[PDB]
Amino acid sequence: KPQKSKPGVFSFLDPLAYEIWMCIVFAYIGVSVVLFLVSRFSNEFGIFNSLWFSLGAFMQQGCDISPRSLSGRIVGGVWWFFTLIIISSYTANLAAFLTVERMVKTSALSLSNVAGVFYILIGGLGLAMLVALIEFCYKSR
Amino acid sequence: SKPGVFSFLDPLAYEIWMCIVFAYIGVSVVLFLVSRFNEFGIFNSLWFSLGAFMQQGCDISPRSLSGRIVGGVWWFFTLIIISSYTANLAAFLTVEKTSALSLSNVAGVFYILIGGLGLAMLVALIEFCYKSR
Amino acid sequence: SKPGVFSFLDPLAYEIWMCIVFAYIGVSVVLFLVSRFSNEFGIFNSLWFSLGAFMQQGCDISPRSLSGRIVGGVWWFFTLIIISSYTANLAAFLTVEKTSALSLSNVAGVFYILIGGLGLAMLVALIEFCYKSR
Amino acid sequence: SKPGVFSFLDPLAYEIWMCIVFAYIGVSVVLFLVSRFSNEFGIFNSLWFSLGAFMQQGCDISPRSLSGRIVGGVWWFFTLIIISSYTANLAAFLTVEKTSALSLSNVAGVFYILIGGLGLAMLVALIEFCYKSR
Amino acid sequence: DRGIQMLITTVGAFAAFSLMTIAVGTDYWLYSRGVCREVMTHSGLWRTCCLEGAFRGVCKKIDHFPDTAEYLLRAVRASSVFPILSVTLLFFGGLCVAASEFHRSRHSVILSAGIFFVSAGLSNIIGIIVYISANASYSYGWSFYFGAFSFIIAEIVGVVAVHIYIEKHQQLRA
Amino acid sequence: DRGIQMLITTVGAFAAFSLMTIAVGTDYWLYSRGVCREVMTHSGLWRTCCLEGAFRGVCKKIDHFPDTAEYLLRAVRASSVFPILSVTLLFFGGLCVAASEFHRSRHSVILSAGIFFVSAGLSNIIGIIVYISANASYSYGWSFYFGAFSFIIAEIVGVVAVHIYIEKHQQLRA
Amino acid sequence: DRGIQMLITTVGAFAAFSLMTIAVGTDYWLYSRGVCREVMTHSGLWRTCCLEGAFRGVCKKIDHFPDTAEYLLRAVRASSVFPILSVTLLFFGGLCVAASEFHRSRHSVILSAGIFFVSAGLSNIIGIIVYISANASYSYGWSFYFGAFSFIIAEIVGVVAVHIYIEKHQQLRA
Amino acid sequence: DRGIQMLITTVGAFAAFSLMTIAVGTDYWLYSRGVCREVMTHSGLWRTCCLEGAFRGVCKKIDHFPDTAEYLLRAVRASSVFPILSVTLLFFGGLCVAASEFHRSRHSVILSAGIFFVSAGLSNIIGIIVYISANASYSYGWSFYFGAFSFIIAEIVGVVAVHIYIEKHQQLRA
C-alpha cells in the first residue's frame, strides 16, 4: 500500500483539462491580435498594449487603457464575457484541487499546497530583473 | 439529460438572462439621459454599464449626483447577480469529486468568443469602407 | 413560504448591515479629513470612492497621500473579508423555504431596487435641473 | 475550540499570510527597481500598485515597460490563485457542521482592524502635518 | 439628418405603441397546461383559453385571487397597472412627438417625448418582472415578445428624441 | 452660508452630545427576557429592569463578570469605556465650537472641533460593536437608536466643521 | 527593417502553410487504442491506422457518423471544414504576400495578406476546438502540434504584415 | 541627506548580514517534538537538539534523506543553498557598499550593492518557502525570525542604495 501522494507544484492547473489551458492561450493570442488589427483600422492599442490589455482583462485587473472604437469594444466585450465564464469555472472549487491526495473535513491551506505559485512568482521577479539588465545594456551600447 | 453546449448559462433561469439584458439597456439609457439633458453619451453609457457588470471597470465614472445614483444601484445589482451566478455555478459544477472540466464542457464559450472576433472584424471593415466613402 | 423580496440581505445579520453602513460613513469622513490635510477627495468623492471600493468597482480617483492610502488599504481589506463572507453561500439564502437554476422570482427584489433607483435618479435630475434653471 | 476574533484568517495557514507579506514586499521592491531602470513607479507607488492588485481594486497607474509588465503579470497571476484559494476555502469553513446568517461577533475582528486603521491614518496625518508645519 | 431622426422617432413611437397595445389586448402571453372551464392553454393578462379539446376557443377570465408581499404581488399583477401605464406613457410620448412639429419655439416638447418613452420602457420592465414572478412546463407566446420588442423600440426612440433636443440646444446656442 | 454652517454645527453638536448622554444614562438598549431578581426585561449599559409581573419596575445592576480575548471583551464592555469616551469627545468638540466664536484669531479651534466629532463617532462605532458582541430572542430599544443617531449627527457635524475651516483658510490666504 | 520584415513575412507565410498542409494530410493527430479492421492506433482527420500487431500499417477511413447540436458537431468534424478553410486562407495570404512585391502601387495587398493570416488562425482555433470536442487514455501526436504551430506562426505573420502596411501609410502621408 | 542614507545603508547592510549569518549558524528555527539520539527538541538547518530529558543539550546531524519534485525539494532543503546564497549576496552587497566610499567616479558600485541586497532577499524568501515546505504541533524560534528580519532589512537597504544611485545620476546630469 503506497503512501498517499501529495498534489504537485503545478496543482493550481488541475481544475481545467490541459486542452482548456492550451485553448485559453490560443484564445488570448487571437483576441490580442484581432484587437490590434481592428484598432489600427480605426495610449493606443498596438500589439504590446493589446497583449497587456487582454492579460489584465483575463486576470480581472484592468490596466491603463480601454478600447474606444465599436469593433474594439465588441472584442473587449466578448473577451470580458469569456473571462467571466472561464475564471468563474476555474475558481469554483480551486482550494479542493490544491489539497487532494491520490493513490498511485475543512482544513486551512498550507504553504506546501501553494508553494508552486510562490516559485513562479519569484522566478518571474528574477526574469524581470534579468530582462531589465539586458534592455539596459542594449540601450547603453 | 446531458449538459448542453451553453451549459454555463444553466445556473440562472432564461428569464433572468433576458431581464439582465433589459436591465442593462434601461440602466444605460437612463445614465445617458441624466448625464446629458470622457462624457456619458449613449455609446459610453453602454460601455460603462457593460464593464461594471462584467467586473472590469472603465475609462470613465459618473460625476453628477443622478449619474452616481444610477451607477451605484447598477453596482449593487451587479454584485448580487454575479455573486448569485458564481455561487450557484459552483453548485452545478459539483453535482452527480475533484474532476477537471473538459474542453467539451466550455466549448460554447469558445464559439461565442470566436464568433465575436469575426463580428468585430466585419464591423471594422464596414466602419472603414463607410468612412472611406 | 417563499423567501422575501429582500432575501439578498439574509446571509448577514441585521447588525452587520447596520455596522457596514456606519463603517462606510466613518471611512468616508476620515478619508475626507486626512485628504484635506495631504480630482480631489472632498466629501462627495470620498463617499463615491468608498462605495466603489466596497462594491468592487473602482472609480475616477485613488488617494495619493500616505494617510489616504492607509485609509484606503484598510477599507480594501475590510471589503475583501466582508464581500467574500457575504458572497460565499448567497444563492442558497435566495432559495430557502437539488441543484437548480435561480428563478426570476428569487431575485425580483434586486430588480425592483434597480428600477426604483433609476426612477429616483430621473427625479433628482429634474430637480437639480429646475433648481439650476431658476 | 470556538472561532477566534480573527477567524476570517483561518482558511490559510499562518505561514501563507507571512509569505504573502514577504511576497508583497519583494514584488514591490523589484517593480520599483526595474522601473527606475527602464504617475511613475517610485517605491511608494510600487507599494500602492501591488496592494491594489492583490486586493482586487486597481490603481491610478500600470507599468509600461517589458520588465515592469513581467512583474505585474506574475503578481496578477499570484493574486488570482491566492485570493481564489482564500475565498474557495473560506466558503468551506462557513458551511461546516444550514443557511445561517453570519453574526456581528463572527466578523467583529475585521471591524476592530478597520477602526484601528482609521485611527492610525488620522495619527499619521497629524504627524505629516506638524512635520511639514515646522 | 433632422428628417431621418424625426422619421425614426415617429415610426418608432407608433411601432412601440402598437406592439404594446396589441400585447396588452391579446392572449398569447403564456402557453401552459390548464383549464378554460387539464389541457394545453394559451393565457394573457386577462383571460385563459384552450387550444385543444371540445372547448377549443373557450376563454375564462383569470382568477388573480384564488403575507403582505404576496398580496401586493397579486394586486399589482391583477390590475396590470405596469403594462397599462407603459401603454399610457407611450401614448403621451407619441402625442408630444406630434406636438413637436407645430410648437418649434418650445424645444422641451421633444425632450418630454423622450422622457415618456424612457419611462414607458421602465414601466414595461417592471410589468414583465411582475408577470413572470406572479406566474411562479410552459412557454411564452408572441404577445409576450411584443411587449419585449415594445421595450426595445421605446428605449431606442427615447435615445433619438433626446439626441434631437441636444442638437437643437447645441445649434441655437452657437 | 457662514451663519447657517455655524448654526448646523452648534445645534448638531448639542443634539449629538444630548442623544449620546441620554443613551449612556438610560436603560432601553435591549428588550430581552431575563430577571431583575424568566420575564420580559429592558436593559442598558448598567442595569436590567423588568416590564412584567410583581417586580415590574425593579431594576438590578448587571453582572458583567458571571481566554484573553474573552476577558478583554468583558472588561471593555463592563467599563463602557467606548460609549463614555464618545460622550467625552463630544463634550470637548462642543467646547471648541463655543470657543470658536470668542477667540477667532486661532482658526484651528473649529478644526479641532471637527476632529473631536469625527473621533467621537469612531469611539461610538467601537462601542456598538463591543455592546452587540458582548451580548452574544431580543430587540433594541430607543436608547440604542439614540447612540446610533448620535454617531450620524457627530459625523455630519465633523464634516461641516472641517468645511468651515477650509472656507477660512481659503478666504484669508487670498 | 523593410527587408527583414518582408523576409519574416514570406518565410513565415510559407512555414505556416506548410505546417498546416502537412497537419491536415498526415495521420498523427491522436494516439489512442482502437482498431484498423483493440490495439494501439494513430489517427488523423481522415484515417485510423495501427501501430502494433499483424495489421501494423493497415489504415482505415474514419466513420464520423456511426440532437441538432450533436449532429452539427459531427458534420463540422467530418468535413474538417475549419482546418481546410485555415489552409485555404493561408494559401491566399501567401498569394497576397507574393503580389505585394510586384504591384506595389496598391498598398492594401499586404494588408489583405495580414487579414488572411489572422483569419486563418481563427479558423485553426475553431478546428482544434471541434476536433477535441468531437473526440469526446490518449495523447496528441506531431500532426496536432503542427496545426498548433501553424496557428502561432500565422498570428505572428498577420501582425508583421499589418505593421508593414502601417509604416507604408505613415511614410507616404508625410 | 547623503550622510544619513549612507549610514542607513552601511548599518543596514551589516545588520542584515549578521542576522542572516546567525540564523544560518544557530539551531532555533523550529521547536517540535522529536529525538536527538520522543522529547521536545529545537532544530535548525543542520542539527536537532533536545531541551528536555537526560540527553538535554545533545545534538544530532539531521537526516535530510530518511518522485522528482519530492527529491528536488529534499536536495534543495538539505544543501540550504538558498539561505547560503542569501548570506553570500549580502556579503557582496556590503563589499560594494564599502567600495562605494573609495571609487566615487564609478557610481554603478552602489547600484550593484542595491541589486545584491534585493537578490539576497529573493533568495531568502525561496529559502523560507523551501524550509517550511520541506518540514511538511510546532513553533518557529528566534533563528527563523532572524532570517525573516534579514529579509526585511535587505529589502530596505536595496531600496536606499537604489535611491542613492538615482540622486547621483540626477544631480550630475543637471
Ligand SMILES: CCCCCCCC/C=C/CCCCCCCC(=O)OC[C@H](O)CO
Ligand atoms: C458598446 C458595447 C459593446 C457590445 C459588446 C457585446 C459583447 C458582450 C456579451 C456577449 C455575450 C454573448 C451572448 C451569448 C448568448 C448565447 C445564447 C445561447 O446560446 O442560447 C442557447 C439557448 O438557450 C438554447 O439552448
Ligand SMILES: CCCCCCCC/C=C/CCCCCCCC(=O)OC[C@H](O)CO
Ligand atoms: C502604501 C501602502 C499602504 C498600506 C496600507 C495597509 C493596510 C492594508 C492591510 C491591512 C491588514 C491588517 C492585518 C491585520 C492582522 C491581524 C493579525 C491577528 O489578529 O493575528 C491574530 C493571531 O493569529 C493570534 O490569534
Ligand SMILES: CCCCCCCC/C=C\CCCCCCCC(=O)OC[C@H](O)CO
Ligand atoms: C454617493 C453617491 C450615491 C450612490 C447611491 C446609490 C447606492 C445604492 C446602493 C445600494 C442600495 C440597496 C438598498 C436596499 C435596502 C432595502 C431593504 C431594507 O432596507 O430593508 C427592508 C425592510 O426594512 C425589512 O423588510
Ligand SMILES: CCCCCCCC/C=C\CCCCCCCC(=O)OC[C@H](O)CO
Ligand atoms: C505581455 C506582458 C508580459 C506578462 C507576462 C507575465 C504573465 C505570466 C502569467 C502566468 C504564468 C504562469 C505559468 C506557469 C506554467 C508552469 C507549469 C506548466 O506549464 O507545466 C508544468 C510542466 O510542463 C509539467 O510538469
